[PDB]
């Protein structure tokens, strides 16, 4: 998949179909982070860097910073 | 005999500032020394996060410099020329008046070549002051 | 060279990596500064400078 | 008059120091042809034909640190002056030319006299030699002029389009709440498409112009190289 | 392009075969070979000494592109004016009654 | 084993690079530097007023005049120059006094 | 801990040998490999016959 | 004696105050130019002679042998004469640094000596001048300093239409 | 005009002025100081390198006899084409 | 070698005695060279005496030709002895360095004095006459050997890399000779195996086509001053003269078997002047004799038969291979039990690194199978 020009790398298969069919999948040994692993969304279960900090919260933080940058002089103007 | 031409002539010990240097190298190596971090002539790395982090920072500091050091000169010139032609005359105004003038200057900047021309061309019959107001 | 790295699948995943967290903060700043300019520079109480015809850059550069 | 100023690479210099205190392989080069001049085996040159590699790499790095990053708004191309680029190209081109001339081999210039003995010497071949000798200097001038003009035009266009986009976005976004919202949406989508297209075009054009800048110098060098065959 | 091999002494055609601007400068006209530039060019081409034609040209261009061009631009003498300010040859002489200092001795 | 880039210090490597690797380039660069500082190192006051200031020349304070005034004051004070000398004024001191009394 | 490679690389670069590919030397040395026992028998046999003659 | 160190200040001052350059000083400088050109010519002739004398026998045979570019007949005669003259006696034909030294050191010495003595001659000439330039030269050699604005101090001659400034 | 003003260096810090006469004189004093000592004979290549080219250029300037007028290099105003003074 | 105060004191103390000894050696060497030059001019071949011109095929630049511009005087023993030739060679080296220093002094007047102080603080560029005792001479020889070690590997690598990158040998024997030519001095090279490389390189590059950078490296390795280098035909002439004298002496010794009767110190010096025997190796007579015999064998029968030595470039590489020491390796093997990236342990693994470990770790086959099965199912559903 892509996010703007950034494309997610994909691992090339190395096993043949015959050998691949003989592989037994045991997700019990897999880490909890990667269970029901999906190539189209491998980071769905990945932990947040900061608990409770959503992406929308950071977006809103940036928007508020912009609003401050543009409006601070309206409330606390300074002379030349 | 006075100074050595060889880099092997050490001036400090091998353990001088080892810890801080190791921390700095850890900062450098973690994201850059990777197989997918293949640079194009040392200038364009392959790691996406490097772009994602450096583009905003570069833009931020450049914009801060431009707004607080470069455009400020044009704003001050406009304020001085339109309100007396001297710094003291501008300082005779209040902060709110200066804010209004500077925001009008920002308006003019935003309009540029794609906007009404009455912001700088006085229509005939207008009662506002002309160019010879202070002369 | 754009070879690899963490790539969030959607917006909600931008919080899974500090670098993308900073990126989304910056994007928020970028996009939210435009509504601020709309509100500030299209305000009812905004008034053109009375002395705007006293001087302009057009006469100066001419 | 002595003006003290600084380049706009200090943060990039800091990043270079941070990320290149340890070694890293390089496998992608803008101008790779400086490393492979000879394609047929058993051919070798007694002239220092690989002397340009270091200068080529450094020039690529410098011009890429400036031009590619100039797409970021408010980033300054500190060297963007016509005569300064003239000085740079003069240095490189004339240095290589004087390297060939200091060799004191006049036969090296025999190829300047274009044509064969059948053509009249005075009225055809001599005029062609004059034109070619002029064309060398003209190639130098064209190289520097092209490099200057590409950046100048691209950045002028970017500035103008960004100004227009700011104007329409700020002073006509209220149309989203009005009955003519469709027109504004169409215009906004067109502006976004134009923005992306311009950025991609500039990104590609910068690298391509650097490639051509180095290729002109390498062509100058190659025009006077002679290869011996191993036996 | 390719390697250049100087011609052997036997491969060089005779001087009498060379042609000038109008025609060959054979006996009774040999001394005119010095003045005929085209004859010299043809002789050089015949002798494979083409550099004599090319080397002076290129170098000249370089000399103009490098050193004389700027010298002419910055220090060259422009065309004289119609009304010329000639020198009256009155300036410089010491005034009457002046006592110049003695020369070294 | 010995290598210039790895064993020699930076100034030594710089000298070696520009003397036995790229000497002609260094010579041409020095030539061009001399040319630039010989023919492109001057700016007249009018040129400074036209293009020498970011936002334009502030005629309301004329900093060029103040700069030249400081320059000339410093020169006069340090060199003990008598600006009342006839060559500077074109007239004798007594004539200057007469003019001062007149005006 | 592999000094020969280090020295060769550094010297090649310091003498303007920037290129990192050597097709000719590889072509000379690519097919080199330790021989099989039967090949050793045959080669020893040729050496022995040569010594006898 | 090092006359150049003294004369550089004088030359710069004359350039700055070239208005008071009498025709005599101009002739002096033209003579200096002519003597510089003459010194260059003689030094080049000496260098060419030394190069020819030290040239290798095979090199001389190739240079002054067949073919003849013009083939007039005088060219061949002259080339043969020079070749025989050079190849008759034994000649020291060094190569490398030795030829460089032999060909250059005499040339450099000759050129430098001639130029230095011509500079001394020019200094004497300016000393003997009865113009403001000569007075400035004498004052420079006396006090060791260049006195600028000297022409207007001692009131050097000016055109009839520019004497108002001296009117004091 | 305004778009053209975006192509300027953005980190100008200080500007210094100096007359050609002053620093040329200072350079000449330095050159005389370093070339004066007795242990540097006038016939040495270093001394000639220092002096001969400058002497030649100054002589060429003095010998110049041009029919046209060359305006002063360091006028107060050199932007007016119809006023060489 | 780096400069030191002890060497500075040594050279300052012995400055004037050294100059006097150098002058005496100059007189003696001028006599010897006068004899040799008269013999060359009288009995030399026409091409050698007339200085025949050999031009390159690409840029037509003249340079010394090994066959024509070098001549071995087989009958020089009648007029000049071997010891006189060795004395002339040593004096040529000392005179070259002294001449460069004197040129600097004349050029810069009295400003060369501090540079002279730098010069006397190191034995690299001082004449041999400045050493008045055995220990001083040993230190001087050590400095010369250090310079040779510093310079030779660059020359060898230049030659080998250029040839290998632009050409390959024709046949297996040439391949073996080329590979064995550039072996380190810790192993013994068989001259018979290595000789064909001379003809191969003659096919590639003769002495007449030697490049200026390679010439600079060679002159560095031969303790010949290189500043100012100037055109390549000056130091090239120096090299040609030195090796011509060496070849004359070698022919004399081979014909008269002088090396067998030569004493230990004289034999060591003879090998050293051929760049075969460093003094820091503390070689015995057996090793010196082995190296000298190998050198003579490399010269080959044709050298005695006709005075024609093999290609000079390959000869110089072969002899200088004795200064190509094995690459240094210091440190106990136990040091390989440490870790280099412990300082990164605190950083841990990010999401992408964890994904890479999961996909390419020991569970890689299971993950690949699961992913491929899921993709196949999705593709089938899509169709
Ligand atoms: C009168 C007012 C004052 C001014 C006087 C001027 C006199 C002028 C004379 C006439 C000259 C005529 C000709 C002028 C031509 C100019 C052309 C020009 O500018 O071209 C643009 C061009 C721009 O180049 P660039 O691409 O920007 O790169 C150059 C950069 O320097 C970056 O390039 P780089 O990174 O490759 O450089 C290498 C860099 C490699 O990287 C680094 O080393 C990193 C650091 C970089 C430093 C340099 C960058 C400077 C950044 C801006 C300033 C920094 C803050 C200064 C704060 C000042 C506060 C007032 O290393 C260095 O820079 C080495 C120096 C490091 C110094 C470290 C000092 C540590 C001190 C610690 C003390 C601790 C004490 C403890 C005590 C405790 C007690 C208890 O400039 C140049 O190329 C250089 C021009 C210089 C010309 C010579 C001028 C004469 C020398 C003047 C020295 C004045 C010293 C006194 C000042 C005192 C304060 C007022
Ligand atoms: C090896 C290098 C290869 C790589 C090259 C790389 C570069 C590319 C090449 C092109 C150059 C690029 C430019 C780069 C920048 C270099 C610097 C630069 O351009 O500065 C110019 C720069 C220009 O001056 P400027 O600063 O613009 O000031 C202009 C003023 O004129 C200055 O005034 P001034 O006071 O300094 O005097 C200058 C004077 C320079 O000249 C002199 O001072 C006098 C002459 C000097 C002669 C030198 C020796 C020549 C040989 C002597 C004889 C040897 C044979 C002896 C045995 C004979 C046996 C019979 O010139 C003149 O003023 C013109 C006077 C002409 C008088 C003509 C009178 C009429 C009769 C003679 C002509 C017509 C004859 C017709 C015959 C018809 C027969 C049928 O400097 C000069 O040119 C003058 C100073 C240097 C003079 C050096 C003289 C030696 C030149 C080399 C001669 C030998 C080599 C050439 C032949 C090779 C054949 C294989
Ligand atoms: C502070 C001091 C400042 C000094 C300034 C002066 C310049 C630097 C001085 C010297 C610096 C040291 C290093 C110099 C280079 C060393 C080169 C080298 O290694 O040579 C080895 C080499 C020894 O090797 P070799 O095996 O014995 O022989 C070489 C092989 O033949 C080689 O075989 P090949 O196969 O290579 O054969 C080809 C070879 C054949 O040539 C040779 O090797 C033979 C020797 C050279 C002959 C040159 C004369 C040719 C005939 C000239 C005819 C002129 C007629 C003009 C008539 C005019 C009438 C009006 O080369 C050529 O074909 C080149 C011919 C020259 C072409 C010149 C083109 C110039 C174009 C000018 C463009 C325009 C200029 C501006 C405008 C001017 C006019 C307005 O040395 C030589 O052959 C002679 C070396 C001479 C060194 C220069 C001596 C300098 C004396 C200076 C005196 C004046 C001082 C003034 C001071 C002023 C105040 C400070
Ligand atoms: C006062 C004015 C000064 C002017 C300014 C000078 C500025 C400095 C430049 C350098 C000047 C020379 C310095 C002294 C060198 C020592 C003498 C010498 O030649 O040693 C032999 C030696 C010859 O070297 P090579 O490679 O063996 O020669 C190959 C030949 O095939 C060799 O031929 P071969 O194989 O047949 O063997 C022959 C050999 C056989 O002999 C022997 O084996 C016996 C030993 C003989 C040589 C002994 C040398 C001893 C050196 C040390 C002296 C003591 C130093 C003490 C220092 C401490 C003092 C307290 O004998 C020779 O070596 C004879 C060589 C040819 C004679 C060269 C001298 C010509 C100039 C002198 C005459 C000037 C007359 C002026 C007339 C004026 C008319 C108006 O010289 C060198 O090592 C070359 C010099 C190295 C430095 C080069 C620096 C660049 C030079 C560029 C010059 C360009 C022209 C000038 C203008 C410059 C403007 C930038
Ligand atoms: C009484 C005695 C007997 C009588 C006299 C006898 C004759 C004596 C003379 C002849 C002697 C010849 C032999 C000499 C051998 C030694 C040479 C040498 O230096 O060896 C390196 C020598 C050490 O040698 P070593 O340790 O034995 O190692 C030798 C190895 O074998 C390493 O060997 P290597 O081969 O690797 O090293 C070679 C290296 C040699 O180079 C170096 O090693 C570099 C040395 C300098 C390094 C400086 C580093 C430190 C910088 C400090 C900066 C300032 C810091 C702050 C100071 C604050 C003060 C308040 O590179 C080169 O060779 C490069 C050559 C470059 C040639 C440049 C040519 C330019 C030509 C221009 C173009 C022309 C084109 C033609 C145009 C034509 C136009 C017509 O270096 C030093 O000792 C460094 C000394 C540093 C002194 C302090 C810093 C400078 C102080 C300046 C004070 C200025 C005061 C006035 C100021 C006024 C202001 C207004
Ligand atoms: C991070 C920043 C750090 C700071 C950076 C500083 C800023 C640097 C910026 C620019 C740097 C690059 C500049 C490049 C310029 C262009 C170079 C170029 O075109 O080169 C072509 C070319 C390249 O040279 P090369 O011969 O092919 O090989 C160069 C390799 O480096 C040879 O290497 P090699 O391995 O083959 O041989 C190694 C060894 C081999 O050993 C030997 O050869 C035996 C020892 C030889 C001793 C020297 C013999 C000299 C014989 C006479 C030479 C001709 C003289 C001509 C007449 C005199 C002209 C002045 O040679 C040596 O060790 C040489 C020792 C030299 C030590 C001096 C180095 C300079 C240090 C600074 C001292 C001067 C400071 C002045 C300014 C301050 C004043 C207060 O140059 C030449 O042909 C050489 C001509 C030399 C002429 C003399 C020098 C002319 C320049 C003016 C001198 C002014 C003296 C002032 C005295 C004091 C007055 C108060
Ligand atoms: C090793 C050589 C030593 C030489 C020593 C002296 C030799 C005897 C004197 C040679 C002749 C001198 O005569 C010389 O003539 C020329 C004219 O031709 C004069 O030159 C004069 O007329 C020419 C005419 O073009 C003008 O350009 C020049 O400006 C002017 O000075 C010189 O001023 C004079 O000095």
The answer to whether D110 touches E50, Cβ cutoff 8 Å, is: yes
The answer to whether A54 touches J359, Cβ cutoff 8 Å, is: no
| Nearest-angstrom CA–CA distance, E74 and E68 | 10
Question: What 8-state DSSP symbol labels residue J62?
Answer: B
Cα–Cα nearest to F54, from B113, C61, I16, B109: C61
| Nearest-angstrom CA–CA distance, H12 and H1 | 20
The answer to whether D24 touches B32, Cβ cutoff 8 Å, is: yes
Residue I12, phi then psi, degrees to nearest 5: -75, 130
The answer to whether H29 touches I63, Cβ cutoff 8 Å, is: yes
- Dihedral in degrees, nearest 10, Cα atoms F39, F45, F49, F54: 60
Interface of B with D (CB under 8 A): 24-25, 27-29, 32-33, 37-45, 54-55, 57-59, 61-63, 65-66, 110-115
Q: In degrees, to the nearest 5, what angle opens at C-alpha H113 toward C-alphas H111 and H118?
A: 95
Mutation site for J-interface testing, chosen from H2, H53, H54, H58 by largest number of J Cβ within 10 Å: H58
Helix (H) or strand (E) holding I14: strand I12-16
CB neighbours of residue C46 within 10 Å? 12
Which residues have C-beta atoms less than 6 Å from ligand 1?
Answer: D 2, 4-7, 13
Question: What 8-state DSSP symbol labels residue I67?
Answer: S
| Nearest-angstrom CA–CA distance, B43 and D16 | 9
Q: H84 CB under 6 A from ligand 7?
A: no
Helix (H/G/I), strand (E/B), else coil: J154: helix
Contacts of J229 in chain F (CB under 8 A): 20
Closest Cα to atom 36 of ligand 5: B5
| Nearest-angstrom CA–CA distance, D22 and J343 | 14
The answer to whether J79 touches J39, Cβ cutoff 8 Å, is: yes
Strand pairing partners for H116?
none
Instruction: Calculate the alpha carbon distances from C11 to A40, C2, C21, C23, J108 in Å.
Output: 14, 20, 10, 11, 73
Helix (H/G/I), strand (E/B), else coil: J49: helix
Instruction: Calculate the alpha carbon distances from I16 to D2, I72, I78 in Å.
Output: 5, 21, 20
The answer to whether J146 touches J38, Cβ cutoff 8 Å, is: no
Instruction: Calculate the alpha carbon distances from C59 to B70, B81, B121, C56, F12 in Å.
Output: 21, 12, 10, 6, 56
Cα–Cα nearest to F54, from E57, B77, H43: B77
Distance of CA D138 to the CA centre of its chain: 16
Q: J227 CB under 6 A from ligand 6?
A: yes
| Nearest-angstrom CA–CA distance, B17 and J16 | 50
The token pair at C3 is 């070879």
Q: B9 CB under 6 A from ligand 5?
A: no
Task: Determine the distance in angstroms separating the CA of I56 from the nearest CA of chain H, rounded to an integer.
Answer: 8
The token pair at E50 is 């083409």
Q: Which residues contact D100 (CB under 8 A, 6 or more apart)?
A: D108, D224
CB neighbours of residue G27 within 10 Å? 11
The answer to whether F12 touches B11, Cβ cutoff 8 Å, is: no
The token pair at D130 is 């004059």
Strand pairing partners for B40?
B44, D28
| Nearest-angstrom CA–CA distance, J216 and J238 | 12
Q: Which residues contact J34 (CB under 8 A, 6 or more apart)?
A: none
Q: To what resolution in angstroms was this structure determined? A: 3.7
Q: Which residues contact J7 (CB under 8 A, 6 or more apart)?
A: J120, J121, J122, J123, J139
Strand pairing partners for D2?
I16
Per-residue b or e along B81-114, where b marks 16 or more CB atoms closer than 10 Å to that residue's CB: bbbbbeeeebeebeeebbbbbbbbbbbbebbeee
Distance of CA E97 to the CA centre of its chain: 52
- Chain interruptions in chain G, by residue before each (C–N > 2.5 Å): none
Helix (H/G/I), strand (E/B), else coil: B4: coil
Taking the alpha carbons of E59, E61, E62, E63 in that order, is the dihedral positive or negative? Answer: positive
What distance in angstroms lies between residue F61's CA and the mean position of ligand 5's atoms? 52
CB neighbours of residue E29 within 10 Å? 13
Token look-up 């023919």 returns F39
Describe the crossing of helices H132-143 and H97-128 by its angle, rounded to 10 degrees.
110
| Nearest-angstrom CA–CA distance, B106 and A70 | 11
Cα–Cα nearest to D37, from D225, D231, D216: D225
CB neighbours of residue J53 within 10 Å? 17
Token look-up 């560029």 returns J125
The answer to whether J164 touches G25, Cβ cutoff 8 Å, is: yes
Mutation site for F-interface testing, chosen from B4, B5, B75 by largest number of F Cβ within 10 Å: B5
Tell how strand A6-7 and strand D228-229 pair up: unpaired
| Technique used | cryo-EM
| Nearest-angstrom CA–CA distance, H137 and H8 | 11
* H96, H98, H110, H115, best to mutate for ligand 4 pocket (most atoms within 8 Å of CB): H98
Cα–Cα nearest to B80, from B107, B105, B110: B105
Taking the alpha carbons of J179, J183, J187, J188 in that order, is the dihedral positive or negative? Answer: positive
Contacts of A46 in chain C (CB under 8 A): 13, 16
Nearest CA in chain I to C58: I1
Task: Determine the distance in angstroms separating the CA of A74 from the nearest CA of chain J, rounded to an integer.
Answer: 43
Question: What 8-state DSSP symbol labels residue J344?
Answer: G
Secondary structure (H, E, C), B12-79 = CCCCCCHHHHHHHHHHHHHHHCCCCCCCECCCECCEHHHHHHHHHHHHHHHHHHHHHHHHHHHHHHHH
Q: H106 CB under 6 A from ligand 7?
A: no
Q: Which residues contact E87 (CB under 8 A, 6 or more apart)?
A: none
The answer to whether E45 touches D126, Cβ cutoff 8 Å, is: no
The answer to whether D194 touches C59, Cβ cutoff 8 Å, is: no
Helix (H/G/I), strand (E/B), else coil: J267: helix
Task: Determine the distance in angstroms separating the CA of G2 from the nearest CA of chain F, rounded to an integer.
Answer: 13
Q: Is the peptide bond before C34 cis (omega within 30 degrees of 0)?
A: no
CB distance from A41 to chain C under 8 Å? yes
| Nearest-angstrom CA–CA distance, G1 and J328 | 9
Per-state percent for chain E, helix, strand, coil, to nearest 5:
45, 0, 55
- Dihedral in degrees, nearest 10, Cα atoms H123, H127, H130, H136: 90
Residue A6, phi then psi, degrees to nearest 5: -90, 115
**DSSP E strands, A1-80:** 2-3, 6-7
Nearest CA in chain I to D79: I9
- Dihedral in degrees, nearest 10, Cα atoms J227, J228, J229, J233: -140
Length of chain C (residues): 62
The answer to whether B60 touches D49, Cβ cutoff 8 Å, is: no
What residue spans of chain D are helical by DSSP H?
Answer: 10-19, 52-67, 82-102, 126-172, 181-222
The token pair at D18 is 């941070």
Task: Determine the distance in angstroms separating the CA of C54 from the nearest CA of chain A, rounded to an integer.
Answer: 20
Cα–Cα nearest to D11, from B22, B65, C5: B65
Closest Cα to atom 12 of ligand 7: H35
The token pair at B29 is 């190596």
């Amino acid at each position: 998949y892509n996010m703007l020009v950034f494309r997610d790398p994909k691992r090339r298969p190395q096993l043949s179909e015959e050998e691949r069919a003989k592989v037994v999948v045991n997700q019990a040994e897999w880490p909890e982070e990667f269970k029901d692993f999906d190539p189209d969304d491998p980071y769905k279960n990945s932990p947040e860097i900061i608990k409770g900090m959503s992406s929308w919260n950071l977006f809103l933080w940036g928007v508020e910073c912009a609003f401050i940058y543009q409006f601070y002089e309206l409330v606390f103007p300074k002379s030349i | 005999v006075l100074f050595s031409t060889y880099r092997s002539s050490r001036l400090v010990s091998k353990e001088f500032l080892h810890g801080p240097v190791m921390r700095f190298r850890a900062l450098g190596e973690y994201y850059f020394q990777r197989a997918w971090n293949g640079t194009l002539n040392w200038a364009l790395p392959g790691e996406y996060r490097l772009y994602a982090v450096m583009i905003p920072f570069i833009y931020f500091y450049h914009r801060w410099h431009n707004d607080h050091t470069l455009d400020r000169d044009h704003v001050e010139k406009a304020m001085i020329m339109r309100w007396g032609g001297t710094l003291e005359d501008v300082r005779k105004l209040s902060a709110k008046d200066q804010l209004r003038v500077r925001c009008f200057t920002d308006i003019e900047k935003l309009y540029s070549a794609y906007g009404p021309k009455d912001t700088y061309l006085q229509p005939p019959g207008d009662t506002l002051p002309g160019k010879d107001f202070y002369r | 060279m754009l070879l690899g790295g963490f790539v969030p699948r959607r917006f909600s995943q931008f919080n899974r990596d500090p670098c993308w967290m900073f990126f989304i903060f910056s994007v928020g700043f970028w996009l939210g500064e435009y509504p601020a300019m709309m509100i500030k520079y299209n305000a009812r109480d905004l008034v053109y400078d009375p002395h705007r015809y006293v001087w302009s850059h057009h006469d100066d550069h001419h | 008059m002595f003006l003290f100023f600084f380049c706009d690479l200090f943060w990039l210099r800091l990043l270079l120091c941070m990320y290149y205190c340890v070694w890293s392989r390089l496998c992608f080069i803008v101008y790779f042809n400086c490393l492979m001049l000879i394609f047929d085996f058993l051919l070798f040159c007694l002239f220092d034909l690989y002397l340009f590699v270091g200068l080529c790499l450094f020039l690529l790095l410098w011009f890429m640190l400036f031009n590619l990053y100039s797409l970021i708004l408010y980033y300054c191309i500190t060297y963007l002056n016509l005569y300064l680029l003239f000085c740079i190209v003069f240095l490189l081109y004339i240095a290589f030319l004087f390297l060939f001339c200091f060799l004191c081999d006049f036969f090296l210039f025999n190829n300047l006299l274009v044509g064969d003995s059948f053509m009249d010497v005075f009225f055809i071949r001599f005029l062609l030699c004059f034109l070619e000798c002029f064309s060398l200097l003209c190639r130098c001038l064209s190289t520097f002029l092209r490099l200057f003009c590409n950046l100048l035009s691209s950045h002028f266009l970017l500035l103008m389009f960004f100004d227009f986009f700011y104007f329409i976005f700020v002073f006509f976004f209220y149309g989203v709440f009005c009955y003519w919202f469709i027109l504004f949406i169409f215009v906004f989508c067109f502006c976004l498409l134009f923005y992306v297209f311009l950025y991609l075009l500039d990104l590609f054009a910068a690298i391509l112009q650097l490639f051509i800048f180095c290729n002109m110098i390498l062509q100058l060098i190659m025009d006077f190289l002679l290869f011996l065959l191993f036996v | 392009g390719e390697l250049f091999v100087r011609p052997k002494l036997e491969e060089i055609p005779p001087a009498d075969q060379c042609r000038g601007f109008f025609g060959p400068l054979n006996d009774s006209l040999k001394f005119l070979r010095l003045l005929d530039i085209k004859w010299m060019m043809n002789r050089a081409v015949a002798m494979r000494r083409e550099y004599l034609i090319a080397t002076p040209t290129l170098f000249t261009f370089i000399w103009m592109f490098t050193w004389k061009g700027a010298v002419i631009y910055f220090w060259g003498d422009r065309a004289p004016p119609r009304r010329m300010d000639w020198n009256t040859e009155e300036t410089g002489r010491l005034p009457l009654g002046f006592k110049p200092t003695p020369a070294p001795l | 084993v010995y290598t210039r880039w790895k064993c020699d210090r930076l100034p030594v490597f710089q000298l070696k690079l520009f003397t036995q690797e790229y000497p002609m380039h260094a010579a041409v660069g020095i030539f061009t530097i001399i040319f630039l500082w010989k023919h492109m190192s001057h700016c007249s006051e009018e040129t400074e007023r036209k293009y020498g200031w970011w936002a334009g020349y502030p005629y309301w304070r004329d900093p060029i005049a103040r700069r030249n005034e400081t320059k000339y004051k410093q020169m006069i004070i340090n060199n003990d120059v008598d600006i009342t000398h006839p060559k500077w004024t074109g007239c004798s001191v007594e004539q200057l006094e007469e003019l001062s009394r007149v005006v | 801990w592999c000094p020969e490679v280090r020295d060769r690389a550094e010297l090649e670069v310091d003498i303007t040998g920037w290129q990192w590919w050597s097709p000719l030397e590889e072509r000379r040395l690519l097919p080199v490999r330790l021989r099989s026992v039967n090949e050793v028998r045959e080669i020893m046999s040729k050496t022995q016959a040569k010594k006898s003659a | 004696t090092k006359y150049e160190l003294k004369m550089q200040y004088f030359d710069e001052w004359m350039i700055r105050w070239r208005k008071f350059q009498t025709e005599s000083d101009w002739e002096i400088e033209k003579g200096r130019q002519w003597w510089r050109r003459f010194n260059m010519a003689v030094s080049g002739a000496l260098f060419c002679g030394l190069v020819l004398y030290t040239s290798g026998t095979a090199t001389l045979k190739r240079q002054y042998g067949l073919p003849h570019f013009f083939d007039i007949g005088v060219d061949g005669q002259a080339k043969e004469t020079m070749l025989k003259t050079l190849t008759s006696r034994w000649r020291y034909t060094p190569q490398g640094y030795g030829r460089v030294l032999i060909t250059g050191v005499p040339t450099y010495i000759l050129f430098v000596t001639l130029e230095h003595y011509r500079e001394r001659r020019r200094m004497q000439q300016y000393l003997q001048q009865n113009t403001v330039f000569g007075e400035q030269m004498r004052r420079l050699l006396s006090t060791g300093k260049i006195e600028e604005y000297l022409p207007v101090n001692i009131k050097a001659t000016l055109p009839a239409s520019q004497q108002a400034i001296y009117n004091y | 005009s305004n778009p053209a003003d975006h192509f300027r260096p953005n980190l100008k810090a200080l500007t210094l002025y100096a007359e050609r006469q002053h620093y040329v004189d200072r350079w000449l004093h330095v050159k005389e100081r370093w070339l004066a000592p007795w242990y540097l004979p006038w016939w040495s290549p270093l001394f000639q390198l220092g002096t001969w080219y400058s002497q030649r250029s100054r002589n060429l300037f003095l010998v110049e006899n041009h029919l046209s007028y060359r305006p002063y290099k360091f006028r107060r105003n050199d932007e007016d084409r119809n006023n060489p003074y | 070698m780096q400069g030191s105060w002890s060497v500075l004191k040594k050279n300052c103390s012995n400055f004037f005695p050294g100059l006097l000894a150098f002058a005496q050696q100059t007189q003696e060497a001028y006599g010897i060279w006068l004899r040799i030059y008269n013999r060359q001019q009288k009995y030399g071949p026409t091409d050698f005496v007339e200085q025949s011109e050999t031009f390159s095929p690409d840029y037509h630049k003249r340079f010394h030709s090994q066959d024509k511009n070098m001549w071995v005087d087989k009958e020089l023993c009648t007029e000049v002895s071997q010891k006189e030739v060795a004395r002339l060679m040593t004096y040529k080296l000392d005179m070259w360095r002294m001449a460069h220093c004197a040129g600097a002094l004349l050029a810069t007047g009295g400003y060369a004095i501090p540079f002279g102080l730098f010069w006397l603080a190191n034995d690299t560029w001082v004449p041999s006459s400045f050493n008045l005792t055995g220990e001083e001479l040993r230190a001087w020889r050590e400095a010369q050997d250090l310079y040779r070690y510093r310079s030779a590997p660059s020359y060898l690598t230049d030659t080998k890399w250029h040839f290998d990158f632009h050409a390959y040998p024709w046949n297996e024997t040439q391949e073996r000779a080329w590979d064995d030519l550039f072996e380190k001095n810790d192993v013994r090279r068989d001259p018979k195996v290595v000789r064909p490389a001379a003809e191969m390189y003659d096919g590639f590059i003769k002495f007449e086509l030697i490049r200026r950078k390679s010439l600079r490296h060679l002159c560095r390795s031969m303790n010949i001053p290189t500043f100012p280098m100037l055109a390549r035909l000056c130091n090239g002439t120096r090299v040609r003269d030195y090796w011509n004298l060496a070849w004359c002496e070698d022919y004399m010794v081979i014909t008269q078997r002088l090396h067998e009767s030569m004493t230990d110190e004289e034999l060591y010096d003879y090998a050293w002047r051929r760049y075969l025997a460093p003094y820091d190796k503390n070689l015995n007579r057996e090793q010196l004799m082995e190296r000298v015999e190998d050198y003579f064998e490399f010269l080959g029968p044709d050298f005695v038969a006709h005075g024609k030595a093999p290609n000079l470039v390959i000869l110089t590489n072969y002899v200088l291979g004795y200064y190509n020491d094995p690459a240094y390796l210091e440190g106990d093997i136990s040091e390989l039990d440490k870790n280099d990236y412990d300082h990164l342990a605190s950083w841990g693994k990010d999401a992408f690194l964890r994904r890479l470990e999961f996909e390419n770790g020991p569970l890689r086959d299971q993950v690949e199978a699961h992913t491929q099965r899921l993709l196949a199912e999705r593709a089938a559903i899509a169709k």
